[PDB]
């Protein structure tokens, strides 16, 4: 199968609460390009193994 | 000689004829043997458009879903 390494997951994550993120949808307007790059990666290549960087 | 006319076909007939009937008969026998040979092959291996079972679908969906 060959999965990704142990030190592949990015540090400093999930510090915010579930509704704290939902409180501001301004995240959809500002910082949207890197979110759309990952989104376009997923529809082209379905595997999470390639789109992790 | 009187019996030969208007009552007899003649030796020329059924010699030029019958061979014509045999010519159709030879075509009828060889193609029927070929049909028995073709159906013996087409049923065993799915190569030609004879005894072919229907498939599921040619085209169903290709549009982008909300998949993971």
User: Collapsing DSSP states into helix, strand and coil, what is residue B40?
Assistant: helix
User: By CA distance, what is A44's nearest residue in B?
Assistant: B64
Which chain B residues are within 8 Å of A43, Cβ to Cβ? 64
Distance CA B37, CA B12 (A): 38
The reported resolution of this PDB entry, expressed in Å, is: 4.1
Tokens of B8: 């007899």
Contact status of A46 with chain B (Cβ, < 8 Å): yes
Distance (Å, whole) CA A50 – CA A33: 19
B64 Cβ under 8 Å from any chain A Cβ: yes
How many angstroms separate the CA of residue B55 from the nearest CA in chain A? 28
- For residue A47, what is the enclosing H or E element? none
How far apart are the CA of B61 and the nearest CA of chain A, in angstroms? 16
Q: In angstroms, what is the C-alpha Rg of chain B?
A: 28
Q: Is A41 exposed, middle or buried (0-12, 13-18, 19+ CB in 10 A)?
A: middle
Breaks after residues in chain B, judged by C–N over 2.5 Å: none
């Amino acid at each position: 199968e060959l999965p990704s390494l142990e030190d592949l997951k990015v540090q400093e994550v999930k510090v915010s609460s579930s509704v704290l993120k939902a409180a501001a949808h301004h995240y959809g307007a500002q910082c949207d390009k890197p979110n759309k790059e990952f989104m376009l990666c997923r529809w082209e290549e379905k595997d999470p193994r390639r789109c992790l960087e | 000689r009187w019996i030969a006319r208007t009552f007899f076909d003649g030796p020329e007939k059924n010699y030029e004829r019958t061979m014509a009937i045999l010519q159709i008969e030879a075509e009828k026998a060889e193609l029927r043997l070929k049909e028995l040979e073709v159906r013996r092959l087409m049923r065993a291996r799915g190569d030609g458009p004879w005894f072919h079972y229907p498939t599921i679908d040619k085209e169903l969906i290709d549009h982008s879903p909300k998949a993971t």
